[PDB]
Amino acid sequence: MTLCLGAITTLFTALCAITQNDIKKIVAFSTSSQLGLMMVTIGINQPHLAFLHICMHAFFKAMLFMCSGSIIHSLNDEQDIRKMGGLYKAMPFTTTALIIGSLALTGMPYLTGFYSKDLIIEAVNMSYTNAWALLMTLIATSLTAAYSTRIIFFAFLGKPRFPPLVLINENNPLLINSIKRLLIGSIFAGFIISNNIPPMTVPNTTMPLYMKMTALIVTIMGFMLALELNNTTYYLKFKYPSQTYKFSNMLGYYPSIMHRLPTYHNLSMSQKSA
Amino acid sequence: SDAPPLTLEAIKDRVLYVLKLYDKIDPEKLSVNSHFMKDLGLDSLDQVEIIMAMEDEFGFEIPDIDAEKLMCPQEIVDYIADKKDVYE
Amino acid sequence: SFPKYKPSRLATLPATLDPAEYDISPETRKAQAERLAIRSRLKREYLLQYNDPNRLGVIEDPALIRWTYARSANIYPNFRPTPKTSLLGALFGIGPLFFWYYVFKTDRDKKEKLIQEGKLDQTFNISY
Amino acid sequence: QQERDPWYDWDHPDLRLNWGEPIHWDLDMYIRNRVDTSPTPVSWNTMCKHLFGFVAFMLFMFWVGEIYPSYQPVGPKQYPYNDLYLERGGDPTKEPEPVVHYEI
Amino acid sequence: AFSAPAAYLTHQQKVLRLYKRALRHLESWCVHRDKYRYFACLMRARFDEHKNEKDMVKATQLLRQAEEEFWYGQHPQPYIFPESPGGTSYERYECYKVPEWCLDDWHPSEKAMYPDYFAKREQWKRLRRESWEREVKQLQEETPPGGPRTEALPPARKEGDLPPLWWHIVTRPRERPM
Amino acid sequence: MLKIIIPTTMLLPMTWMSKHNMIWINATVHSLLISLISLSLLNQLGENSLNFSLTFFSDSLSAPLLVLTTWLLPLMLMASQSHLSKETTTRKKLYITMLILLQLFLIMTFTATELILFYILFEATLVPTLIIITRWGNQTERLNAGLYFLFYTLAGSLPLLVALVYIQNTTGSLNFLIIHYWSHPLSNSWSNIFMWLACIMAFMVKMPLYGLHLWLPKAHVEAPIAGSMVLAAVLLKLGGYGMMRITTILNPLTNYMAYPFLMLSMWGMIMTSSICLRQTDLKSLIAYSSVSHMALVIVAIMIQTPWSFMGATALMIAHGLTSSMLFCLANTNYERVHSRTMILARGLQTLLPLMATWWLVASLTNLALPPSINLIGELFIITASFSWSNITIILMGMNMMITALYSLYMLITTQRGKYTHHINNIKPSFTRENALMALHILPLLLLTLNPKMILGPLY
Amino acid sequence: PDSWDKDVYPEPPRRTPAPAPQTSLPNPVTYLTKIFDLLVDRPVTLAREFIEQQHAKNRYYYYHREFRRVPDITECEEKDILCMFEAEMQWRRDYKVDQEIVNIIQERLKACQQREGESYRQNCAKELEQFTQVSKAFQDRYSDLGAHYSARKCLAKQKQRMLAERKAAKEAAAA
Amino acid sequence: GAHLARRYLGDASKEPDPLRMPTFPPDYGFPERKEREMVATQQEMNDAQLMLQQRDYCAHYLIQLLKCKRDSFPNFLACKHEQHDWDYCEHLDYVKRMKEFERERRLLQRKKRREQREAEMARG
Amino acid sequence: GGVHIEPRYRQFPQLTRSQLIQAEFFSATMWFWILWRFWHDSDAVLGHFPYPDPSQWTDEELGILPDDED
Amino acid sequence: YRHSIFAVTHVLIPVWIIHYYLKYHVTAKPYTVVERKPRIFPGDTILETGEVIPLMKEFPDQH
Amino acid sequence: EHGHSKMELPDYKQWKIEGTPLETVQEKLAARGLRDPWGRNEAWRYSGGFANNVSFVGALLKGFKWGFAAFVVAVGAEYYLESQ
Numbered sequence A: 001m002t003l004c005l006g007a008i009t010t011l012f013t014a015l016c017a018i019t020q021n022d023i024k025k026i027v028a029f030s031t032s033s034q035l036g037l038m039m040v041t042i043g044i045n046q047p048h049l050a051f052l053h054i055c056m057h058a059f060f061k062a063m064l065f066m067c068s069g070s071i072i073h074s075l076n077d078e079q080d081i082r083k084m085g086g087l088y089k090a091m092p093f094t095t096t097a098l099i100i101g102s103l104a105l106t107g108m109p110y111l112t113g114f115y116s117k118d119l120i121i122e123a124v125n126m127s128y129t130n131a132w133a134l135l136m137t138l139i140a141t142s143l144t145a146a147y148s149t150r151i152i153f154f155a156f157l158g159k160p161r162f163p164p165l166v167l168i169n170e171n172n173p174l175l176i177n178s179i180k181r182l183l184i185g186s187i188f189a190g191f192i193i194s195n196n197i198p199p200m201t202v203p204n205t206t207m208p209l210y211m212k213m214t215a216l217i218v219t220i221m222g223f224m225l226a227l228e229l230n231n232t233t234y235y236l237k238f239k240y241p242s243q244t245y246k247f248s249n250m251l252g253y254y255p256s257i258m259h260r261l262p263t264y265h266n267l268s269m270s271q272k273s274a
Numbered sequence B: 001s002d003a004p005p006l007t008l009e010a011i012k013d014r015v016l017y018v019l020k021l022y023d024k025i026d027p028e029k030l031s032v033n034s035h036f037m038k039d040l041g042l043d044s045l046d047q048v049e050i051i052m053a054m055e056d057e058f059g060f061e062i063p064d065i066d067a068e069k070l071m072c073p074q075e076i077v078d079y080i081a082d083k084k085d086v087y088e
Numbered sequence C: 001s002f003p004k005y006k007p008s009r010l011a012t013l014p015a016t017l018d019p020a021e022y023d024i025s026p027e028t029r030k031a032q033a034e035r036l037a038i039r040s041r042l043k044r045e046y047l048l049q050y051n052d053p054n055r056l057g058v059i060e061d062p063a064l065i066r067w068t069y070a071r072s073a074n075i076y077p078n079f080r081p082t083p084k085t086s087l088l089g090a091l092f093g094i095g096p097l098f099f100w101y102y103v104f105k106t107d108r109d110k111k112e113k114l115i116q117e118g119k120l121d122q123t124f125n126i127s128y
Numbered sequence D: 001q002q003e004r005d006p007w008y009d010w011d012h013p014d015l016r017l018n019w020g021e022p023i024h025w026d027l028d029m030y031i032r033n034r035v036d037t038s039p040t041p042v043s044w045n046t047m048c049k050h051l052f053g054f055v056a057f058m059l060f061m062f063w064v065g066e067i068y069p070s071y072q073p074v075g076p077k078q079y080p081y082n083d084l085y086l087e088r089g090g091d092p093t094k095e096p097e098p099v100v101h102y103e104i
Numbered sequence E: 001a002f003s004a005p006a007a008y009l010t011h012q013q014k015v016l017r018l019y020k021r022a023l024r025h026l027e028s029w030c031v032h033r034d035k036y037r038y039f040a041c042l043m044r045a046r047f048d049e050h051k052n053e054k055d056m057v058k059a060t061q062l063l064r065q066a067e068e069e070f071w072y073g074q075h076p077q078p079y080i081f082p083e084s085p086g087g088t089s090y091e092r093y094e095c096y097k098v099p100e101w102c103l104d105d106w107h108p109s110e111k112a113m114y115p116d117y118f119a120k121r122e123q124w125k126r127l128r129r130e131s132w133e134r135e136v137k138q139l140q141e142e143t144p145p146g147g148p149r150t151e152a153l154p155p156a157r158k159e160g161d162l163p164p165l166w167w168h169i170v171t172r173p174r175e176r177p178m
Numbered sequence F: 001m002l003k004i005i006i007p008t009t010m011l012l013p014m015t016w017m018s019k020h021n022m023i024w025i026n027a028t029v030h031s032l033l034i035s036l037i038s039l040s041l042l043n044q045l046g047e048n049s050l051n052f053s054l055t056f057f058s059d060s061l062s063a064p065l066l067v068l069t070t071w072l073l074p075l076m077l078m079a080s081q082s083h084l085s086k087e088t089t090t091r092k093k094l095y096i097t098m099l100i101l102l103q104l105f106l107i108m109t110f111t112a113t114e115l116i117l118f119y120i121l122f123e124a125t126l127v128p129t130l131i132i133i134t135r136w137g138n139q140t141e142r143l144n145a146g147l148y149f150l151f152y153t154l155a156g157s158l159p160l161l162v163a164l165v166y167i168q169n170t171t172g173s174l175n176f177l178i179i180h181y182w183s184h185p186l187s188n189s190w191s192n193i194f195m196w197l198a199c200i201m202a203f204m205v206k207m208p209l210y211g212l213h214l215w216l217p218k219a220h221v222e223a224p225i226a227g228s229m230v231l232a233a234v235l236l237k238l239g240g241y242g243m244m245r246i247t248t249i250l251n252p253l254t255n256y257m258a259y260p261f262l263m264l265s266m267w268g269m270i271m272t273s274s275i276c277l278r279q280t281d282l283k284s285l286i287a288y289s290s291v292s293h294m295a296l297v298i299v300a301i302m303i304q305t306p307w308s309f310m311g312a313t314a315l316m317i318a319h320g321l322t323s324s325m326l327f328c329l330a331n332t333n334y335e336r337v338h339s340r341t342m343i344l345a346r347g348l349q350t351l352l353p354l355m356a357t358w359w360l361v362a363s364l365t366n367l368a369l370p371p372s373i374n375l376i377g378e379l380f381i382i383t384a385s386f387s388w389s390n391i392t393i394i395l396m397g398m399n400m401m402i403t404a405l406y407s408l409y410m411l412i413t414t415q416r417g418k419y420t421h422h423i424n425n426i427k428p429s430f431t432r433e434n435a436l437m438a439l440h441i442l443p444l445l446l447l448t449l450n451p452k453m454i455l456g457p458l459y
Numbered sequence G: 001p002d003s004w005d006k007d008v009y010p011e012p013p014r015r016t017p018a019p020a021p022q023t024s025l026p027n028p029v030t031y032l033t034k035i036f037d038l039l040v041d042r043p044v045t046l047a048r049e050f051i052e053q054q055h056a057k058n059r060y061y062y063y064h065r066e067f068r069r070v071p072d073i074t075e076c077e078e079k080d081i082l083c084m085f086e087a088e089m090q091w092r093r094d095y096k097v098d099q100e101i102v103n104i105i106q107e108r109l110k111a112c113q114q115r116e117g118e119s120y121r122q123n124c125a126k127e128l129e130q131f132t133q134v135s136k137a138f139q140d141r142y143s144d145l146g147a148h149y150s151a152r153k154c155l156a157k158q159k160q161r162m163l164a165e166r167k168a169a170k171e172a173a174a175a
Numbered sequence H: 001g002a003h004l005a006r007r008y009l010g011d012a013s014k015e016p017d018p019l020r021m022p023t024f025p026p027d028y029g030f031p032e033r034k035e036r037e038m039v040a041t042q043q044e045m046n047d048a049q050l051m052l053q054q055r056d057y058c059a060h061y062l063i064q065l066l067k068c069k070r071d072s073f074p075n076f077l078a079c080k081h082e083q084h085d086w087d088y089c090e091h092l093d094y095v096k097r098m099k100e101f102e103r104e105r106r107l108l109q110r111k112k113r114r115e116q117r118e119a120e121m122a123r124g
Numbered sequence I: 001g002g003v004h005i006e007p008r009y010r011q012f013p014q015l016t017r018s019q020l021i022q023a024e025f026f027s028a029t030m031w032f033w034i035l036w037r038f039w040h041d042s043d044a045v046l047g048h049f050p051y052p053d054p055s056q057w058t059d060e061e062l063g064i065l066p067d068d069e070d
Numbered sequence J: 001y002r003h004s005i006f007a008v009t010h011v012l013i014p015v016w017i018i019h020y021y022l023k024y025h026v027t028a029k030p031y032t033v034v035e036r037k038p039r040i041f042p043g044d045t046i047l048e049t050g051e052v053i054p055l056m057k058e059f060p061d062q063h
Numbered sequence K: 001e002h003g004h005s006k007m008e009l010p011d012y013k014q015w016k017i018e019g020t021p022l023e024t025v026q027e028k029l030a031a032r033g034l035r036d037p038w039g040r041n042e043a044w045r046y047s048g049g050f051a052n053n054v055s056f057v058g059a060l061l062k063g064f065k066w067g068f069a070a071f072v073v074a075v076g077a078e079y080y081l082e083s084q
């Protein structure tokens, strides 16, 4: 039950994040997907690996939210990525910190997120589990790469899209130092902690070569597919959305129905009968 | 925050600036009191596009009931000044 | 060719999709004028009391008083025993009680029978 | 109460009410903090169908994956001392039936 | 917000509102500025070919089908300005807005600081006290019999007069008090 | 035990001979001294009891109730000082006399080593509270509330008198010690079933049980502030106390006769918690919260396990303190707005921040937030119920959920949002009201450090 | 520590490895514990020396109460209220003492589980067994008496248990 | 995986159930049957208190690795021969498990062929 | 606590040399770390031990007798 | 100077109080402070007894 | 102490449709016989430091050159130091 709950959580939350426009909402769904992966690790009887992932995710997700807040503050309280244009050169330190955080989140080799997510995918691949939970875990990893691409591309790469009066400013030592401490964390803490803790589980020493490369292959496929599909937005054509986009944007319609049907049917009765 | 305290002069300068990039209006003719419907020969849709441009310029949204009945650049400036509470 | 929107109780029909606002009639305009007039007299009264410098209390709202009195104190004088009310009251006031009684009685009968049989494993069950 | 005009100058801006107008019998149920009936882009029935279908499909395929598990081409792990008898429960005064592991 | 509502919306107002909504949701759909400009001009052209439709009946069948079209293509997550009723900072500073009458309940030791402010405040209160007895009479003499018909307030027509019901419009707390 | 009774009786000439402007000060000071004196009773011993004399005795169940009863009177005086300002001196003295007589009867009620004396004082407490409700009450519904409160209680209590005299005539005694030592089982019979009912219904009316709770919203909404304080804090607990005393003679009939009341309490806790969510009156909401908590106490007492009784004692003390504090906060709002509807005055945190933090702490204690003693009682009753039957956790969890819901709903509705524009008579909180809230809440958080003081005789 | 009895709360002899460093790189743990000692343990030790000599300057004793044994509820007449009172008080005292014994055994069990590390499932079998025995005995003595427990109810429970035992033994002997 | 494809789409009876393997006697292949060896004893493996799942046939290398890590603490990269030795022993153990799986599969195939040939001979 | 930066109104904002060097230095640090670790620990991303081929194993190794023993 | 006085009043005094309370009050009672026994490996010697744990079985060392 | 430096608005005649994607928008629009009236209002987004774009891969490889140089010199130094 823990494995199934984690798998469905990570997949559904990655699916929701793939199409959100609020940067904070995107990072929140990223956190939800990572927690789902954590309990997926719990379900395959690997608690210490889940704890290590907790420790790594702390660093890089905290710094991702830090950079998001920097962007929001420098753009006069603007959260939507549609009014976020070319900030790659306007805000260089936030740009590099967000790039490093997204690379660590997407499990770039030898990055804080490598030493936990890599082994989590290895362990779920080499275990007696569901086929469906495994499928959803891999698809969720791909979707993680995809929404990291979405954030970077729609917030840093194009032309500016914010109001004309530019108030962009990074030069405050508090913000810079606070960001760079978590940068150093996201770069070295994974290696340091993994090499400093005693071994508390049997490793997956020998695997088929394609199975060992599964995490990187899936992340790269997600990167490329998201990038290609995002580049199509420059095209001068307009099409109405599909049912899949509507489902993803409205969070699987879960907040709508579940926040209108039960509540009403409770409160109604709470006066009508009782 | 770190946002400057905009004033009437800046608001008026920005409104006239945005109006000047409207090629449907000859820049050398428009003034602060220039009516849109008559002094400039604009349409209703032209007026709603102008109100949209001002909104995107200043970063806030004007309600339709208040937007539909703003007909001079000075009128827009005074509406923005009332909304932002800028006395000087 | 666009699929139509079907309203529901918790997802209502938008105003811009209401045929009523497009079925314009002079009596519709009369009704709208009366509604705006009613709102206008009410707003004038509220603002006249509201901006008074001599007022140092609460502007009483007869509508709010009517709402609260109807919600609490007007119920019983307007209650009549009808098939609907009687059946609904009997159901919602008795059914849960007997349902829960049956559930807990069945559980405790099973537990007592298992205890008398001795196959329950109450080991370390000290604090009760 | 959520779908009232947010731009009108109400006497109660948060509740979106005017002094004097009749109050809905269930005002405290619609207070913008609770159930709202504002129109949605998608119809209620369509949303119900899609959400129910997604959840049912996920449940079905999780059960299917339960029926058809996934594993590696390996045998069970071998543990030295009578399947680690003494370290799991103990009972060292019973002399368990010896189980030994075959070397390949 | 400021302007009074009318008894209804005319055809032109509804069409203008639809044009505004369609352009905003189109801008939400096509993100980049060049794409938005191209498709907004296409939209304006599509909005213009029936500008001269003379009779009301087909001009009402039109702008009705357009509403269904918009509701089908409305981009369920439109961009919202941060301070707009849907925005992420809609009422963020609403808890910092303290009424002015609270100043009357301050301790005298608190009013010992800021003496100039409270002198000016007393002047404002005196002005309001006189103006109110003037404005009640003005509003009584100007209102038509049977009560007001709209939410419109006449201005001050005399020299020493002030607009009726001005105190709670000019003594607003601020847009961002803190 | 006379060292507490005699000063409380001397409180009356002290009030009647006081100067016209010193009655409140003298009453508060000397009632506080009595509250200090009562703390000595808290020194209980693990064996039988503190048998002071043939007429009075103290126990680990009677002691916390006595301490709470003595502590409540200064708070009642402090709360009543304001709205009774325009009252003549004689009638203010009469109000204080009613409060003092109520405390005297309550003090004698818990000690009361014999059951008929307990009945007499238990019923004598009904007179001063009825006079308080029907005389110093604002609305026109105080008369109907007085009638309901009177007749529910008396219809419940008269069969108790009949059963008590019957029991004394059969067994020879009604002394609690002899009754406990010479206990004999109750056989399954119609006469025994009716004796059980006559013994139980008197205390089940005053808890109140679900279905017999109609008098409580009336008598709490329409009463003055001191009346509401004494009704919620102490007067609701009498029935609880009585049950803990009398169920020593009702076994083993209790196991089979408690099912209807167990079902009624378990379902009515959910029903009343749900009622609290749709409530346009603050006093009504607090009253229904009281109903829910006392339903949980009823379940505990009927289960009849050591953990049930410990949790019930803890929950009684905690709920008394919390409900008294909530009523005082609502009265602080009411004395400014004069409306007693929850939606009228909004955004009060912007205008009264310290009242807002008092509201927050009262909600958190009502919330059953650990490690507060509210949670201690809640959790002990829940554990005992889980041992009794495992599906009980469903109802208990649903109740805790809805309790959190309506507590935070009450906090957010009144303290948060935007203030009402037309209300401009929200004066800053007096020192009296802040002191009242502090004297309500500090003992709760102090009792969290020594829980055995309020866990009853089964600790 | 001489404060508590080692036999009541047993502890294994606490074997610890010697430090056998393999490299010449200085580890910061020993330096940190040395500075901690010099900077914390010494002043605390001096304060304790002062406090202990002050307490020794004023030495006085308190005693543990001794309770004489009294006839129990079995040799008490049906309505003899004084004998019943004394027997009941004695029974309550015995109940409290048994509660404390069970508490001691539980403390032993928890300490063993913490101390044995990863091999607790094997190395704490003795404590688990003795807790099982004590729990069974306590459960037989005191469970299901109710909130209104007394010596008479415990005696009745024991009497019905021994009726069951006598019946079972009689059936087995004559089987 | 391909084994899952073969078992869940082809004939299940020709492929092993991983939960019940082995299904055959261990002497069925050859009679010498050299036994597995365990280097870490009972008491000192207990005293290392590794883990219950870490007390397998590679326990000696893990004990040595832990001892090295304890001794050379600050230079946490000094124990590379020990970690490689432990990982290589784990690799050999996993390879032996794969060999057991393949042996079970091939004896199952041989048993199927033998029973089918016996049935054909009986029919003829 | 920082420095003074003035708005531009449709022009690129001011950039201090310090922020540019700090960003470039940290990017270079990340890339150098990745290359160094990869060079040093190629096996972690590739594996140290080849996967054996079950088909290659001979019949005698697993004890396979083609209906000859019994 | 500020850092020094801060580390005095915020780090040193609390650790003094906590160490006194643990060393002379908490550890006065049994089982209040329990430590997991340190790991014993082949080849270590024990401070209390001085003996050496016998080495392992000299497995075949190749690769 | 805030940012009060009397910022002056630039000239409004700098912004030109030429050399930007707005020119291509204009061409495609005139192909259907239309014109964009707000073209010059949005040219500032392509004018200054905003004129040049960076690819996604070019963004991810932000400081790869210095990192590669440091990696090469470090490995060369290690190679020299080891063979001794």
Ligand SMILES: CCCCCCCCCCCCCCCCCC(=O)OC[C@H](COP(=O)([O-])OCC(O)COP(=O)([O-])OC[C@@H](COC(=O)CCCCCCCCCCCCCCCCC)OC(=O)CCCCCCCCCCCCCCCCC)OC(=O)CCCCCCCCCCCCCCCCC
Residues within 6 Å of the ligand: A018, A019, A135, A138, A139, A142, A143, A146, A150, A218, A221, A222, A225, A226, A229, A233, A239, A240, A241, A242, A243, A244, A245, A246, A248, D053, D054, D056, D057
């Ligand atoms: C063993 C073999 C190993 C090899 C494996 C295969 C190798 C690779 C194969 C590649 C396969 C396809 C890859 C692309 C995926 C689709 C992406 C795409 O093109 O989206 C555009 C397109 C719609 O675009 P649009 O509406 O025009 O966008 C509007 C604008 O663009 C507005 O745009 P915007 O700017 O607002 O935002 C754009 C955003 C928004 O776009 C979206 O709308 C998002 C929706 C598409 C994402 C969904 C992908 C996976 C879904 C998983 C769901 C699990 C099962 C759920 C079942 C539900 C049942 C009800 O899109 C993105 O950002 C990128 C999307 C994600 C692509 C990157 C990662 C995907 C690759 C992973 C797929 C498989 C590889 C796994 C790796 C491991 C190998 C096992 O999406 C689709 O058409 C859907 C395609 C697939 C959906 C299938 C679900 C249909 C369910 C119907 C019912 C079926 C019967 C059930 C019976 C039930 C009985 C009760």
Ligand SMILES: CCCCCCCCCCCCCCCCC[C@@H](O)O[C@H](CO[C@H](O)CCCCCCCCCCCCCCC)COP(=O)(O)OCC[N+](C)(C)C
Residues within 6 Å of the ligand: F039, F064, F067, F068, F071, F317, F443, F446, F447, F449, F450, F454
């Ligand atoms: C504003 C910012 C904060 C400022 C303050 C900063 C300082 C913070 C310190 C305060 C909180 C930190 C927790 C510290 C707790 C230490 C005190 C604790 O140990 O004492 C408790 C003891 O406290 C009392 O037990 C609880 C107080 C009694 C409450 C009775 C209420 C008083 C009358 C009020 C009216 C009653 C009405 C209610 C009905 C009952 C428990 O002690 P205990 O281990 O056990 O035995 C004491 C020592 N012995 C062994 C020698 C005997």
Ligand SMILES: CCCCCCCC/C=C\CCCCCCCC(=O)O[C@H](COC(=O)CCCCCCC/C=C/CCCCCCCC)COP(=O)(O)OCCN
Residues within 6 Å of the ligand: F152, F155, F156, F159, F162, F163, F166, F190, F191, F192, F194, F195, F196, F197, F198, F201, F205, F212
């Ligand atoms: C909030 C409203 C509550 C209304 C009252 C609820 C309590 C009702 C309980 C019954 C009341 C009378 C009990 C009598 C007191 C106990 C005495 C006793 O038990 O002795 C019995 C007497 O038992 C009776 O007489 C019972 C007769 C009942 C008469 C009044 C009935 C009242 C209504 C009955 C139906 C409802 C019962 C439950 C109501 C619950 C509340 C809704 C027999 O003794 P002996 O005859 O001497 O010895 C036996 C050998 N001959």
Ligand SMILES: *OP(=O)(O)OCC(C)(C)[C@@H](O)C(=O)NCCC(=O)NCCSC(=O)CCCCCCCCCCC
Residues within 6 Å of the ligand: B043, B044, B045, B046, E011, E012, E015, E016, E022, E025, E026, E046, E047, E048, E050, E051, E052, E053, E054, E059, E060, E062, E063, E066, E069, E070, E073, E074
């Ligand atoms: O002079 P003005 O006051 O400015 O009046 C303006 C105008 C003349 C155009 C208008 O007010 C008017 O009077 N029109 C008369 C007839 C008329 O316009 N009838 C309606 C024409 S139908 C129409 O508007 C075209 C449909 C386009 C809407 C499709 C929505 C698709 C977008 C969905 C989101 C991307």
